[PDB]
Design a protein around this ligand. Structure first.
Ligand SMILES: Nc1nc2c(ncn2[C@@H]2O[C@H](COP(=O)(O)OP(=O)(O)OP(=O)(O)O)[C@@H](O)[C@H]2O)c(=O)[nH]1
Ligand SMILES: Nc1nc2c(ncn2[C@@H]2O[C@H](COP(=O)(O)OP(=O)(O)OP(=O)(O)O)[C@@H](O)[C@H]2O)c(=O)[nH]1
Ligand SMILES: Nc1nc2c(ncn2[C@@H]2O[C@H](COP(=O)(O)OP(=O)(O)O)[C@@H](O)[C@H]2O)c(=O)[nH]1
Ligand SMILES: Nc1nc2c(ncn2[C@@H]2O[C@H](COP(=O)(O)OP(=O)(O)O)[C@@H](O)[C@H]2O)c(=O)[nH]1
Ligand SMILES: [Mg+2]
Ligand SMILES: [Mg+2]
Lengths: 428, 426, 426, 428
């Protein structure tokens, strides 16, 4: 019943920092590993120290060093903290090939070591970003190997969705297009969120006009914990990760369920307001709490999964579902009946001490696969196209051995993906 | 004379958690395993569900099955999880994930061999089995998927024993798995012809009853599964305890099945009303019959007056006159003659037990076989078709090797049950 | 043998609050529901209005209906609101607003189905119904609007049961709703031909009596509805309790209705005077007859000596001689021969019960059917016409779909009752 | 059984401030929402805090900020407090169109959120003023949307009637004429009061020669509470808001019932004087207590509703009615019989601590629809005409996209309205 977390790149690792901090908060784990009390994620020592079963990869020492100098440096095993010396430079060509390919063997052997520590490997999940060099480059490299060795294990990916308006990486389209090509075909499911959309959540629901990544990742951590800690904890409907895959992936392509999370409420907003299960789920179908800037009303739904924490009675859930099925404007694709996975954990929602979110007594996470995602690809299509037509920055990949045909090909694969969304949109 | 019960899936495991609790209540058996009752009858027929182990320990004759230790653990952690022996916990590791293919066709299939071995060990422990009962969900992976597989093998080993099952039927409003109708369709395809009878429980209907007549605003599944166990326990106790009428499960099965393929049941229960009104209720046979006939007191989301009634069983617990029961059942038949099928004269049958359920003076269990049941099948079949055309999540299933033509045949078979209900609906 | 009562509208609900109070007084039934009396008769015929629920709890056979929970709640909050079971509170959410169209024609119509279902449940609970009684206002939305709808369906289900109703008739001076005559007109249109009989209560007349003879300066509606309940309870107790004469409601109806359409009644009551004079009163049959005949002791704002008397019923409670009663009624007939109709020989009929109302030695209920009643209809019809021409508030009604030609026919029908009273006024 | 209050503009909000203060006074609600004890207006939290179901709209931060800095800032949910940055400038053209139309979507979504919080929305009422930019401009904009979404719910409006003598808004006629055009057709009923008439009440019945708006709105609040708090509380004749509409609106045009309120008495005037129900209602038919400067004796009555608080016995009411029907000079239109709605609540009248009105044991509110209202329109007709003939100030609307024809049209609609009053006056 075990799983592995993999943190690649800054985004992967810094999100991971929040994630493991939250898992410590879930059980009262001390920075040194001492836990007085979740062995699906952790491995126990004779001292009662538990080791989070995870791998941290950075090709630049700095971020891992940040871990190594922080409080959780005692928690993590030195072998889990893997670092190279040089970067990918925002570039798949080095991340996947030239540079990252050198260290990956080590990385894999640490993974395999942990796989041998697992007794019942259920699977794993990889945290990264769609635009970066290691964030997406190295990441796909890893998938190429992991899908061989662990072909039957859960291969869930979580990635930051490139913001349409702000991006620090000029060749991000190129990176992301190459990842599509290589991740679609290897991964089982990839989830993503938009930091821009999140900012809007922070300013509207948390009332914060100063979000940093350390805020943004707390919110992400909430979502992740709902599906990682609480799915291993007790509930009414205990849903596994493999079950998630078995209930969220409808086609052999990928699919890309997007996250939505409600409650996201400031302490003051929690006052004077009573949420019910149904009210929270109402919020879950509002564009306003959509974690990716993509309009839910534009597309049609294919999948939807609702996962519940704390004070949730199935009775209320059932009523809530009835209304979301019938009251809303949620259009859905023919193919699908509304079999929405309901996970119901008794495990209460948790809050980070010193965080922004209010203590809540119940909480709902929503995953959804909508046809509007093709518009996200359309965004990438043109951004890629523009650059590629001019061949701007192309020498930074070509010099590492990339082929122009390959890039065209990858775009075409994306186009095919868009076409398949088109297909799904056609009802039948 | 004895019964073996097997629970599977998170649903089945949690239902059974209440079922066994009740059975031990009925007999005065402590959560730790020993007998501390106080009635002769309490031990007298205990054999049907318990093995007395050395030390005056009673072992529930049941197997708990799952593919995740944590659910099993939670069951074990409560009272009455200690009464089960470790050997009755058969489980694997890695879910099923609510996937029929995994449950039945592939992975769960692997576990079934160990389950069956224990089943065999218990079949030997019994003197003479009357039958087997299984608890599960129709749209679940281990509930239906693995559970079905097991049933086909048990039936094979014991053609001469009663094979029935109670199962949670996907409610129109709350499906959890997107392909819950798919799993259900496949289970019909397998179960119907591999079972003697199956009961149809709708959670939605149950939630309506709990608020509608019981006026409760906090139930959980444990409270609703209490109601489920009331009907299950109602059936077998009579068989166990002294009564007036004819107290044999097989005979019940014989009286309720007019046709080899149409064996689906609508359970209902009386009395079943809030405490406020309990000060304004009278306890008579007509009172129970009013609650029994009323569709709102059915636990299945069907409407018996929409369809036609093929068979009705009225089981009574506690001291009642024979006359009164006979007359009121006749009256029911008379007044609701428009719903009964004309081919069966006196279509309402009775069974009478003289032991009341603990705490009540009297009670009654409604079991029906109407044509109305077909409506549930119709809802599923339709939903199925849509999904079938799109192959939603079928890559998960076909990825594990489930073939679409098998599913095609499953669809037909659903439609066949509907057409046969039409054939006898007339 | 039994009666079902349904209350509707704020008026009807508050009247019933006093009615049931009195009935329980009559039988010694506590505000909480149990029987703590002390007379054999108190339980003996209790069946007509109560179901004995387990525990010696008595359930009033009545349904409380409204479209605002708050009124229902206020009823429930007092003594005797606890005796009613929750199942007898049938209500919606959002008023009616004193709108016939909403009540009858549209929204209230929606609720009626749930009301009727409970009605059916109670009709089954009875052994044998004598009839039904409803309490309501003629110019109100749920009182008349929804109430009427219900009546048409109950009558349909039970043609053979007595259908009567008591209703507050818009007093000349105090109308609340601007279209109160409209609602009343529509209720005549519907009610008269869908009821066996209706009673005409005028609050203005009641306020005069309470000060005129009772000399009271503080009444509320509860005090006036006490008087109303005195007449209602007066009628049914005799039917319930041992007497001398002929104590059946249907027989009363038979004796009071000479013509299929003219069934409107003027209730009155004796003795009914202030305490001061109680030291100067004598209690004889002529004393009661003096109070009964006197128009000022009528609860309807009519004047029987203006019209002609078609039928008179004199109901007596307590020990009286037959001779004295016979003679005094004869004397009345003789001396007031100028008001009686010549077609009916001996137009004054009697009924005698030997049980006095609690606290009194004797009492009498006056029920009359005069032609004078037509004057009320005339007042309404006239007021109606004016409003009709202007469509005052009819956009609210036509907005909910009520058609003006239906109203036109309603107007005719009012005029028809007047012409028929003229046809028998001679 | 729920309802929504909407406060638009200063007038709407400042009146609302008094209104919600009074509701707090009705139940002992603490500024923080803590109530120790009316859920038709309020929504309950797990802390026992109740939130007034209302929306506050101001396009200028200041007034809402006044709320935000006052004691009731703890009472109101931050989302209820909606503010823009710029004003309408006394001008429908910006209030309804150019400016207010930008924020209205937010406003509506907060309304809809509350509508979803309602379980049995009975309806709502809007507080504003006939002359202002947001007061009337934005207001009608709102009605345009609310009448779609909540078509079957109560749409009661309350507005300040432009004083014939003092007005601070030179284009008020123009604003009000445009509102007529758009509100008549959308709203169900609009009530109004005249601050000048009120001043006369303050100086004659309260004996106060220094009324401010904070006094004036207390008096308004009294009237409103009679129909809002006490109609949800217990009585003999419990009258609902929908019932009010069903008993006050006779035609599908609008109608405009005017307020009258008696008792309005200073503490010293209460001494040495005993009011009865009948005496209070006598006062209600006196011009002297008429809240709008329009002569009751001039027109004819069409509707009349009397709502009673405290120590009222129907017995006395009946007698009072008899005398007002027969003793008075109240002429009434043929169409109507005198079916005057009597609401009788046991709920006693309440008084604001530190207010001007005396503690009373019983109280009567009167609504009435009289034909004299056409004279009010006549006032507007000429004021509009004068300006419009010269085309004074016209560029302040034209520059925002208004049409001259439109303005003519709106006047004509008013003229039609006057003609319908003429019609009603003709008895038939
Ligand atoms: N939510 C979130 N997004 C982040 C965080 N850090 C970076 N990102 C986003 O991820 C992308 C940045 O990737 P980089 O940090 O440039 O690169 P990398 O993927 O770590 O790998 P290299 O390019 O080789 O350094 C941008 O789109 C950022 O907006 C973080 O802590 N949280
Ligand atoms: N009774 C009462 N009337 C008020 C109050 N405040 C303003 N008024 C009246 O309402 C009108 C003033 O509207 P303004 O304040 O100018 O404007 P607004 O309607 O808030 O909207 P903008 O023009 O965009 O500022 C005048 O006729 C005032 O006499 C108040 O608190 N109470
Ligand atoms: N009555 C009832 N239904 C349950 C319970 N648990 C899950 N269910 C129902 O079972 C279906 C889900 O299947 P599940 O039991 O999770 O499948 P499995 O665990 O993979 O075999 C849903 O329709 C639920 O409403 C329960 O304890 N009681
Ligand atoms: N006697 C009497 N009349 C009442 C009572 N309540 C309202 N009324 C009368 O009923 C009429 C108003 O109708 P109402 O009952 O409010 O209608 P509804 O509540 O909308 O069905 C008026 O003529 C009132 O005098 C009451 O408790 N007793
Ligand atoms: Mg980096
Ligand atoms: Mg302003």
């Amino acid at each position: 019943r075990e799983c592995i977390s993999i943190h690649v790149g800054q985004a992967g690792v810094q999100i991971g920092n929040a994630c493991w901090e939250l898992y410590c908060l879930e059980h009262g784990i001390q920075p040194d590993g001492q836990m007085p009390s979740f062995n699906t994620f952790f491995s126990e020592t004779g001292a009662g120290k538990h080791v989070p079963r995870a791998v941290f990869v950075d090709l630049e020492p700095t971020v891992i060093d940040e871990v190594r100098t922080g409080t959780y440096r005692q928690l993590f095993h030195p072998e889990q903290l893997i670092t190279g010396k040089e970067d990918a430079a925002n570039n798949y060509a080095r991340g996947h090939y030239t540079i990252g390919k050198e260290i990956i063997d080590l990385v894999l052997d640490r993974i395999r070591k942990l796989a041998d520590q697992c007794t019942g490997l259920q699977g794993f999940s990889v945290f990264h970003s769609f635009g970066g060099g290691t964030g997406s480059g190295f990441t796909s490299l890893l998938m190429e190997r992991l899908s061989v060795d662990y072909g039957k294990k859960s291969k869930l990916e979580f990635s930051i969705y490139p913001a349409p308006q702000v991006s620090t990486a000029v060749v991000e389209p190129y990176n992301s297009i190459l990842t599509t090509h290589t991740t679609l075909e290897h991964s089982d499911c990839a989830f993503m969120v938009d930091n821009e959309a999140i900012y809007d959540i922070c300013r509207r629901n948390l009332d914060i006009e100063r979000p940093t990544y350390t805020n943004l990742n707390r919110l992400i951590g909430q979502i992740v914990s709902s599906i990682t800690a609480s799915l291993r904890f007790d509930g009414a409907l205990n849903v596994d990760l493999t079950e998630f895959q078995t209930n969220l992936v409808p086609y052999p392509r990928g699919h890309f369920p997007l996250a939505t999370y409600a409650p996201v409420i400031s302490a003051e907003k929690a006052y004077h307001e009573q949420l019910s299960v149904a009210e929270i789920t109402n919020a879950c179908f509002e564009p306003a709490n959509q974690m990716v800037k993509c309009d839910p009303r534009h597309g049609k739904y294919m999948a939807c999964c609702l996962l519940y924490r704390g004070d949730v009675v199935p009775k209320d859930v059932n009523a809530a579902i009835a209304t979301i099925k019938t009251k809303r404007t949620i259009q859905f694709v023919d193919w699908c009946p509304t079999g929405f996975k309901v996970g119901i954990n008794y495990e209460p929602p948790t809050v980070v001490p010193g965080g922004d979110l209010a203590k809540v007594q119940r909480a709902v996470c929503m995953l959804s696969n909508t046809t509007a995602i093709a518009e996200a690809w359309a965004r990438l299509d043109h951004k890629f196209d523009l650059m590629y037509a001019k061949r701007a920055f192309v020498h930074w990949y070509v010099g590492e051995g990339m082929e122009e045909g390959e890039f065209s090909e990858a775009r075409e694969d994306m186009a095919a993906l868009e076409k398949d969304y088109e297909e799904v949109g056609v009802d039948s | 004379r004895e019964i073996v019960h097997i629970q599977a899936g998170q649903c089945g495991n949690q239902i059974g958690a209440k079922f066994w609790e009740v059975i031990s209540d009925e007999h005065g058996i402590d959560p730790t395993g020993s007998y501390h009752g106080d009635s002769d009858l309490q031990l007298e027929r205990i054999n049907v569900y318990y093995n007395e182990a050395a030390g005056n320990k009673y072992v529930p004759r049941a197997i708990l099955v799952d593919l995740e230790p944590g659910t099993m653990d939670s069951v074990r952690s409560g009272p009455f999880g200690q009464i089960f022996r470790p050997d009755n916990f058969v489980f694997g590791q890695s879910g099923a994930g609510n996937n029929w293919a995994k449950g039945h066709y592939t992975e769960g299939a692997e576990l079934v061999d160990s389950v069956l071995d224990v089943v065999r060990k218990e079949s030997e422990s019994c003197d003479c089995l009357q039958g087997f009962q299984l608890t599960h969900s129709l749209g679940g992976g281990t509930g239906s998927g693995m559970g079905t597989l097991l049933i086909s093998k048990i039936r094979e080993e014991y053609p001469d024993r009663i094979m029935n099952t109670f199962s949670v039927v996907p409610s129109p409003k709350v499906s959890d798995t997107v392909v819950e109708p798919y799993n259900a369709t496949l289970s019909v395809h397998q179960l119907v012809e591999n079972t003697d009878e199956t009961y149809c429980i709708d959670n939605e209907a149950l939630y309506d009853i709990c608020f509608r007549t019981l006026k409760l605003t906090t139930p959980t599944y444990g409270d609703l599964n209490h109601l489920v166990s009331a009907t299950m326990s109602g059936v077998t106790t009579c068989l166990r305890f002294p009564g007036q009428l004819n107290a044999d499960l097989r005979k019940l099965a014989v009286n309720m099945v007019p046709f080899p393929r149409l064996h689906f049941f609508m359970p209902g229960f009386a009395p079943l009303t809030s405490r406020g009104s309990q000060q304004y209720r009278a306890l008579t046979v007509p009172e129970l019959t009013q609650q029994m006939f009323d569709a709102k007191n059915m636990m299945a989301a069907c409407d018996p007056r929409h369809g036609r009634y093929l068979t009705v069983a009225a089981v009574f617990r506690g001291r009642m006159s024979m006359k009164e029961v006979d007359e009121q059942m006749l009256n029911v038949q008379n007044k609701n003659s428009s719903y009964f099928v004309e081919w069966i004269p006196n279509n309402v049958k009775t069974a009478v037990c003289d032991i009341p359920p603990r705490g009540l003076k009297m009670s009654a269990t409604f079991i029906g076989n109407s044509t109305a049941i077909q409506e549930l099948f119709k809802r599923i079949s339709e939903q199925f078709t849509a999904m079938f055309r799109r192959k939603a999540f079928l890559h998960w299933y076909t990825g594990e090797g489930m073939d679409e033509m098998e599913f095609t045949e499953a669809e037909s078979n659903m439609n066949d049950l509907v057409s046969e209900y039409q054939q006898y609906q007339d």
